């Protein structure tokens, strides 16, 4: 594999280069059906870029096509969320879904059950904001989510995960953190991924109930990603 033969800096630059673009929303105060339409439209367009971002994650093309489908089906909502949470960092109390679509907790009350997921997302972004999460760390966490979330459902994937762990420590040793501060920040960052998985499971269930509620129809791609979680 080519991913294992990469230095830690060559790993960071490859991930930074693979970053998907920040997409815009379509453009009046929001009804329930209107906000869900914009959110699912945005998420559907982002999924096309995520798939091409995943192919540029080191080692991901080495997997069989089946393993790629499984890892993306598992982690797609996690990956969208950690991207939303990263964008909203320098916007406390707000969620930057798109540069033209910045929402706060009150606008989350527009939809049934959106407020709880909203507060969990705001809390995650606030947590990143307090840890001074850096972009080189964020791109590592997002790739970890891609390769780790579905691996328990494989020896090569764990070798790439170890490589990203080497990359994270390599970044923290640059910033000047001591050895003790390196275990602790590594642990703190990875513990966030447990909460991100929690938000994904909660959001996946609200998306499923909105499917049967049939307020706004969903794209067949987004439905196929949702069906994989049932």
């Amino acid at each position: 594999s080519l991913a294992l033969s990469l230095t830690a800096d060559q790993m960071v630059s490859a991930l930074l280069d693979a970053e998907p673009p920040i997409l815009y929303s379509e453009y009046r105060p929001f009804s329930e059906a209107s906000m869900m339409g914009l959110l699912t439209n945005l998420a559907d367009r982002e999924l096309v870029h995520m798939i091409n971002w995943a192919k540029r994650v080191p080692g991901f093309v080495d997997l069989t096509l089946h393993d790629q489908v499984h890892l993306l089906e598992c982690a797609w909502l996690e990956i969208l969320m950690i991207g939303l949470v990263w964008r909203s960092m320098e916007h406390p109390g707000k969620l930057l879904f798109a540069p033209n679509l910045l929402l706060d907790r009150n606008q989350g009350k527009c939809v049934e059950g959106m407020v709880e997921i909203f507060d969990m997302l705001l809390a995650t972004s606030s947590r990143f904001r307090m840890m001074n999460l850096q972009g080189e760390e964020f791109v590592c966490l997002k790739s970890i989510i891609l390769l780790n979330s579905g691996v328990y459902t494989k020896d090569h994937i764990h070798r790439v995960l170890d490589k990203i762990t080497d990359t994270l420590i390599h970044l923290m040793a640059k910033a000047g953190l001591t050895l003790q501060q390196q275990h602790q920040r590594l642990a703190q960052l990875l513990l966030i991924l447990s909460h991100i998985r929690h938000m994904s499971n909660k959001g996946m269930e609200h998306l499923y109930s909105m499917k049967c509620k049939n307020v706004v129809p969903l794209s067949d791609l987004l439905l196929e990603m949702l069906d994989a979680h049932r």
């Binding site: 096309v48 798939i51 995943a54 489908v69 993306l72 089906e73 067949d220 196929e224 990603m225």
Partner: peptide, 10 residues
């Protein structure tokens, strides 16, 4: 079949 296969191969 899955749309995800197409975009993963294109």
């Amino acid at each position: 079949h899955k749309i995800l296969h197409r975009l993963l191969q294109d």
